[PDB]
Design a protein around this ligand. Sequence first.
Ligand code: HEM
Length: 153
Amino acid sequence: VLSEGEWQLVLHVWAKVEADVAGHGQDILIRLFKSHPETLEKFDRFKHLKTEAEMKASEDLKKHGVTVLTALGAILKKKGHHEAELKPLAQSHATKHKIPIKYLEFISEAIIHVLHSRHPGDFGADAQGAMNKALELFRKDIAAKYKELGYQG
Ligand code: HEM
């Protein structure tokens, strides 16, 4: 359970992200795909992209980055009271998209890295630890839904 102070650190940096949702979403998906190429393979929509320059030039990838970060921002702003938001997301990601929980760990790393690069003054160690806790809570709660459905592994 995050404390109120931890949530304030999370949402203070997240308010900075929302000034350029699309640039953050590009940076995060590109980092995810470069660091963990198995993740790119899960996207029929993107797996034609073979270089970082091609990824940066894809408007559709930029659009999807906004979709992803909008869903995550709505979850973070619930401060843990996010059951209604996680139900459909766990269902799609477990049963339709077939995304292992481990790949959610990978995107969480990519998010933390990009936030550190773009917002160092608001993303010191205290805020890094709080965002790590928030993303752990996200993964814990999604993993419980995966397990219900027979996909935790
Ligand atoms: C912070 C974590 C993530 C969030 C908030 C998120 C959110 C979303 C949302 C909102 C959609 C569209 C609605 C839906 O299908 O449920 C979507 C689609 C999708 N997501 Fe995620 N996602 C996350 C992580 C991942 C990861 C790590 C992968 C793959 C490694 C992935 C793969 C996909 C795929 C394949 C689609 C469908 C894309 C398409 O063909 O339109 N997601 N995601």
